[PDB]
From a paper:
We also solved structures of unbound 3BNC60GL and 426c.TM4△V1-3 (at 1.9 Å and 2.0 Å resolution, respectively), and a complex structure of a 426c.TM4△V1-3 bound to 3BNC55MAT, a mature VRC01-class Ab. We compared the unbound 426c.TM4△V1-3 structures to those of 426c.TM4△V1-3 complexed with Fabs from 3BNC60GL and from a mature VRC01-class Ab, 3BNC55MAT. We found no major structural rearrangements resulting from binding of either a germline or mature Ab, suggesting that the 426c gp120 core immunogens are preformed for binding to germline and mature forms of VRC01-class Abs. Arguing in favor of the idea that the 426c immunogens could select for an altered binding mode, we note that a mature Ab (3BNC55MAT) complex with 426c.TM4△V1-3 exhibited rotation and translation values closer to those of the germline Fab/426c immunogen complexes than those of mature Ab-gp120 complexes.
The HIV-1 envelope (Env) spike, a trimer of gp120-gp41 heterodimers, is the only target of neutralizing antibodies (Abs). As exemplified by VRC01, the first such bNAb to be isolated, VRC01-class bNAbs share a common mode of gp120 binding in which the VH1-2*02-derived variable heavy (VH) domain mimics CD4. Two forms of designed gp120-based immunogens were subsequently engineered to bind and activate germline HC/LC VRC01-class B cell receptors: gp120 outer domain-only constructs (eOD-GT6 and eOD-GT8) (Jardine et al., 2013; 2015) and gp120s modified from the clade C 426c Env (McGuire et al., 2013; 2014; 2016). Here, we present crystal structures of inferred germline VRC01-like Abs alone and complexed with 426c-based gp120 immunogen cores and compare and contrast their gp120 recognition with structures of mature VRC01-class Ab/gp120 complexes.
Residue numbers in the entry:
A (entry chain C): 1 to 206
B (entry chain B): 2 to 52, 52A, 53 to 72, 72A, 72B, 72C, 73 to 100, 100A, ...
C (entry chain A): 45 to 123, 197 to 308, 325 to 396, 412 to 488
Write the structure that this text describes.
């Protein structure tokens, strides 16, 4: 079958920038697509070098050997979306393009579960990261210095129009009885805007 | 030249589901249809292709026997039957037309959202996160849910996160906004269950 | 020496005194076979052949479609726009070899290289007016009553890396297949007049498959070759579908496309189907019940129509399954060597 590699996994640029992307395939016949937020892909170029009618001249592609390059002459607000490279039944991992913004560090806040909720029988703890760029950030919950897995879910904002900063929420769900057993609950954050990892917690059973 | 897909469909785990694309504007029989699905914030996964002329389907090993593709030439419609619905089957399902031997997909459907969960309609219970401060909208069904603060008075510094489906099969979301540190209410409207709640944060 | 495209003519041995339908159509539409076949080898030559983009195939397609319109008239024909009800008389059915020839001002190039895969250059070339006799046998999965490969099995594929490209296989060892509908008294009696079966020798097919599996491992190195039943589709594909004596046979081939095949003689279950999906055009055609008496067809398997499993490989095993349904590929299996 076909081996496919796409890098970089993420990229950032501003209007007028030169954006280049690359994917490699042992097999031939690569094609490129543009996938915008919540929409089906749009065919941009087929065979890696041939451009489909109705696609601007800003887009052009050249490939040499086992390497295929996608290049945009002058980026525009429209272009900021995920680009995939395909060949036959296989799609690449994908690269997401985000607008360039000065690097920012996440403001970290933690909210404990409400008493009314506890009566319900479900315990929920929230950890919030705000207005941070770039998007790549890792949160991991620690209960009594015991890193927890399979109980944490999270969601992420899309880039703010002006702020250009994402936000991320992580929710930990625990049975009421289990919550009682551990005293401390901590949210550790890794980010390129943080010199050292940041941990914010409430060391209160109540 | 367009493919038009079925609407959002919800089915309980272990059940069976149907999606349909309708071809128009081109000779239905001359172009393969490839099916793809992508879960939220993720890459495209191959479901299989079907030959409209001879009816021949091909599938990937992972889905062998759970998924079957069919065609109807009198309607010019393509169908995708997925059974034994697991939790991971939640996602958006696309159908695309294979234009050439290059295997370019020029014409795409707009996607069919599928949701796997034990059927229920529900209004969000509300829990609030004290301090940044916010509102926690949990155990609601279906989408969407609209959350605003102070009846639209507070417009800046508010973040209502995307809804995420939970193990139970019920969406759960939180919304909160930054406030002046020195400084010292939510508008939650869930249309499907006549539930409008404003909760106070203390 | 120039690529050309023009209407051709057929030459047959069709006898006017024959009530068999292929002859009736052939006597009326074809000229007698040229008594002496003139072939001229070119000692130092080369030309590029494309079996997958040949008008000769599309020409026989129009012809074989025409034949079936005279011979096998359905009682009812449903298509997307039309509904037909008409008389559906039974007929004596037998494929007769058809020769395809070039008119005045044109000639045919035939690759005599014994191992030509059908696409690209062949160092050795010849020229004849008429092609060898080709029976227009309509079938799926198994290729019947065709010409056989001289030296070794051949794998034909426009692109093997394209899993959606059918894979035509030409054998060097014909395997006899007999499909019969046993004789039984009448349609009114209690007997099931649509029950049928085939018998293929297990050792012959099992060893032939091993040779096909061997030739495929040369195009897919470092991989295991597996044969499994059809992944699905219309009944015409998932079964060995063909017409024997004017009746439509649907023969389930789970016993043939298996990784381990028994030595002993194999028995395939079949069914005569009135309701069939048309290959000539997209639609359904319904035919009258089967005729009385024994219906048998001793045929020779000379090739296959295969389709490879796509996607990420689970066990480093490449799985090929039976397929078909586009009769143009059946014609390509024979006319691959000719060009105009
Ligand atoms: C794939 O390729 C194989 C071989 O290449 C081919 O097998 C051949 O099948 C045909 C049948 O289609 C065989 O020909 C038939 O042979 C029988 C028996 O012939 C012997 O026995 C009789 C009686 O003892 C002898 O007289 C004779 O000399 C032989 O010894 C014949 O009975 C068949 O004749 C009928 O068809 C003729 C037209 O082709 C008619 O002119 C003739 O009158 C017969 O028709 C009668 O029966 C009809 C139906 O019952 C009826 O409708 C008519 O009214 C009429 O009464 C026939 O000649 C042939 O021998 C096989 N070839 C080999 C090498 O064994 C497959 O058929 C082929 N498959 C496909 C799909 O192409
Ligand atoms: C493709 O672009 C990369 C930089 O993104 C560059 O290093 C590489 O040489 C380019 N290759 C081709 C064939 O254009
Ligand atoms: C072409 O091949 C045939 C055998 O397939 C051989 O008899 C003939 O001499 C060859 N002609 C040339 C010119 O090589
Ligand atoms: C025959 O054709 C094959 C390609 O199908 C080629 O590799 C081979 O060299 C040819 N041999 C001769 C003798 O023409
Ligand atoms: C198997 O094939 C051989 C020739 O390859 C043939 O002689 C033999 O009769 C066949 N066996 C059966 C049972 O048909
Ligand atoms: C084919 O026959 C085998 C056994 O002979 C059976 O297991 C299988 O279900 C059949 N499939 C079809 C499509 O007829
Ligand atoms: C019988 O079949 C097995 C594999 O199915 C094979 O190993 C064995 O050699 C066969 N026996 C004969 C006599 O061919």
């Amino acid at each position: 079958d076909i081996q496919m590699t796409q890098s970089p996994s993420s990229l950032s640029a501003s209007v007028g920038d030169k954006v280049t992307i690359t994917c490699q395939t042992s097999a031939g016949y690569l094609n490129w697509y543009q996938q915008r937020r919540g929409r089906a892909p749009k065919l941009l170029m087929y065979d890696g070098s041939r451009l489909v009618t109705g696609v601007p001249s800003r887009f052009s592609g050249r490939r040499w050997g086992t390497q295929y390059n996608l290049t945009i002459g002058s980026l525009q607000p429209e272009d900021i979306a995920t680009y995939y490279c395909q060949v036959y039944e296989f799609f690449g991992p994908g690269t997401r393009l985000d607008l360039k913004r000065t690097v920012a560090a996440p403001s970290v806040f933690i909210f404990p579960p409400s008493d009314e909720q506890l009566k319900s029988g479900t315990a929920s703890v929230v950890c919030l990261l705000n207005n941070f760029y770039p998007r790549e950030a890792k949160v991991q919950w620690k209960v009594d210095n015991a890193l927890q897995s399979g109980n944490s879910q999270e969601s992420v904002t899309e880039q703010d129009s002006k702020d250009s900063t994402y936000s991320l929420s992580s929710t930990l769900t625990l049975s009421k009885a289990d919550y009682e057993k551990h005293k401390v609950y901590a949210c550790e954050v890794t980010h390129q805007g943080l010199s050292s990892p940041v941990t914010k917690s409430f060391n209160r059973g109540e | 030249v367009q493919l038009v897909q079925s609407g959002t469909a919800v089915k309980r785990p272990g059940a069976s589901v149907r999606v349909s694309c309708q071809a128009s504007g081109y000779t239905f029989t001359d172009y393969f249809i490839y099916w793809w699905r992508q879960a939220p914030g993720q890459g495209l996964e191959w479901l299989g292709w079907i030959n409209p002329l001879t009816s021949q389907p091909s599938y990937p090993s992972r889905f062998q026997g759970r998924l079957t593709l069919t065609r109807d030439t009198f309607d010019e419609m393509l169908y995708m039957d997925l059974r034994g619905l697991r939790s991971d089957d939640t996602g958006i399902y696309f159908c695309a037309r294979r234009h050439s031997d290059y295997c370019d997909f020029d014409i795409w459907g707009s996607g069919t959202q599928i949701i796997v969960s034990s059927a229920s309609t529900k209004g969000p219970s509300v829990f609030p996160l004290a301090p940044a401060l916010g509102c926690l909208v949990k155990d609601y069904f279906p989408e969407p849910v609209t959350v605003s603060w102070n009846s639209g008075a507070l417009t800046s510094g508010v973040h209502t996160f995307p809804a995420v489906l939970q193990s139970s099969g019920l969406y759960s979301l939180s919304s909160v906004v930054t406030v002046p540190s020195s400084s010292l209410i939510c508008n939650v409207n869930h249309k499907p269950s006549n539930t409008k709640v404003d909760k106070r944060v203390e | 020496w120039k690529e050309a495209k023009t209407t051709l003519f057929c030459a047959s041995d069709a006898k006017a005194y024959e009530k068999e339908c292929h002859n009736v159509w052939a006597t009326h539409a074809c000229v007698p076979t040229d008594p002496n076949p003139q072939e001229v080898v070119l000692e130092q030559v080369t030309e590029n052949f494309n079996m997958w983009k040949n008008d000769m195939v599309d020409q026989m397609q129009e012809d074989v479609i025409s034949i079936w319109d005279q011979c096998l008239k359905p009682c009812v024909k449903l298509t997307n726009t039309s509904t037909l009800t008409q008389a559906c008389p039974k007929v004596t059915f037998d494929p007769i070899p058809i020769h395809y020839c070039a008119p005045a001002g044109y000639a045919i190039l035939k690759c005599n290289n014994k191992t030509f895969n059908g696409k690209g250059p062949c160092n050795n070339v010849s020229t004849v007016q008429c092609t060898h006799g080709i029976k227009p046998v309509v079938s799926t999965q198994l290729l019947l009553n065709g010409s056989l490969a001289e030296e070794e099995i051949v794998i034909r594929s426009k692109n093997l890396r394209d899993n959606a490209k059918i894979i035509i296989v030409q054998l060097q060892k014909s395997v006899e297949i007999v499909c019969t509908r046993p004789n039984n008294g009448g349609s009114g009696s209690g007997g099931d007049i649509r029950q049928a079966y085939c018998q293929i020798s297990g050792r012959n097919w099992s060893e032939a498959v091993n040779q096909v599996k061997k030739k495929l491992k040369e195009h897919f190195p470092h991989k295991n070759i597996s044969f499994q039943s059809s992944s699905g589709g219309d009944l015409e594909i998932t079964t060995h579908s063909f017409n024997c004596g004017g009746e439509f046979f649907y023969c389930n081939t789970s016993g043939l496309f298996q990784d381990t095949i028994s030595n002993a003689t194999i028995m395939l279950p079949c069914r005569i189907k009135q309701i069939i999906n048309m290959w000539q055009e997209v639609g359904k055609a319904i035919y009258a019940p089967p005729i009385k008496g024994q219906i048998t067809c001793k045929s020779d398997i000379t090739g296959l129509l295969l389709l490879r499993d796509g996607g990420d490989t689970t066990d480093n095993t490449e799985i090929f399954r039976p397929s078909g349904g586009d009769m143009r590929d059946n014609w390509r299996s024979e006319l691959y060597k000719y060009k105009v």
